[PDB]
Amino acid sequence: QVQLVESGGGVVQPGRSLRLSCAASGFTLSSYGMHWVRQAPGKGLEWVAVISYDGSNKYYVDSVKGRFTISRDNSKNTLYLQMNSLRAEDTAVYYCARGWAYWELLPDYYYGMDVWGQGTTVTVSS
Amino acid sequence: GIYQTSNFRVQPTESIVRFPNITNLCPFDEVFNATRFASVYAWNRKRIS
Secondary structure, three states, X not given: OOEEEEEOOOEOOOOOOEEOEEEEEOOOHHHEEEEEEEEOOOOOOEEEEEEOOOOOOEEEOOOOOOOOOEEEEOOOOEEEEEEOOOOHHXXXXXXXXXXXXXXXXXXXXXXXXXXXXXXEEEEOOO | OOOOOOOOOOOOXXXXXXXXXXXXXXXXXXXXXXXXXOOOXXXXXXXXX
16 A cells, blocks of 8 residues: 655754654655655645655755755665754644656656655744 | 590579577567657657667
8 A cells, every 4th residue: 555654753952953754655665756745734835855766866945955855765665854953944744745657757847746644743842 | 435524413493591580589569559658858768789
């Protein structure tokens, strides 16, 4: 069964670094694109970062570039999201999503977000 | 007397050619019977050997 299990989120003091953990079931993440989309109550859906299916290209929104970096290990099927030097705006319900694959050859600027996991919230609390 | 005068031989009539089967072939069905096709800009480039 296809599912995404997210863990490691929680209360983080500002300035402290936390590394998310996520596992995938029902497929191989090395063939599919994966999205990090935080959701905040009273706000709009926010996109943080993506990891390429082959891992060649990694892109970050201007509010997370260089400060939050994503890593993958496909041998164990795990994805680690790094949250360095937390700021208050990072308090949102973070989700992980899965996208299309090389199986259906698709043009550039890939499309995705067909399934996503239960999502884990990080709360930047003082 | 005796006179060595002529030379004779027997000539063939048909030909035969042989080759070690056709066991290996070039798989080209996946090109025509492709599940999905490539975009206009950029393309799959399949090298055959």
